Amino acid sequence: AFKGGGPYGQGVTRGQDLSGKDFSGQTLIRQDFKTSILRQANFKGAKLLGASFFDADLTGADLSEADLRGADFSLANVTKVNLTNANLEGATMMGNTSFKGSNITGADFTDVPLRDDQRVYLCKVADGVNATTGNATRDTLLCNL
């Protein structure tokens, strides 16, 4: 329970080194993690609607079962992140974002705009149904049409 729980002021989370910090299950709607370091951070089941991970480093983080609707992952390092059952409906991930090594089993990528190259990679590793939405990960990604 990071700093006993919060809510957290934006100054607490923005441009900070928060590696290995535990935010699991917390309400973090529109929390500003822009350009923070979040390696191995725990966001399992966190509520992160509209949160900013703009140019954050999420390497190895747990975002499994997180509510990430409308969150911004543009320019983020999302390598080796657990996104099992994460809801990314309407999130953004512009530019040089890397998802290399990430587990996206049952992730929901509805209305997430993707470049061809991002869709190609994600579709190589995409499977499952979202425990929450029953959308098929491959369909949200439009892998097969």
UniProtKB/Swiss-Prot annotation:
One of its GO terms (cellular component) is chloroplast thylakoid. The keyword tRNA processing does not apply. Keywords: Chloroplast, Plastid, Repeat, Thylakoid, Transit peptide. The keyword Metal-binding does not apply. Residues 36-75, 76-116 form the Pentapeptide repeat domain. It is found in: Plastid, Chloroplast thylakoid lumen. Transmembrane segments: none annotated. This is Thylakoid lumenal 15 kDa protein 1, chloroplastic. It comes from Arabidopsis thaliana. The lineage of its organism: Eukaryota, Viridiplantae, Streptophyta, Embryophyta, Tracheophyta. The chain holds residues 81 to 224 of 224 of the full protein.
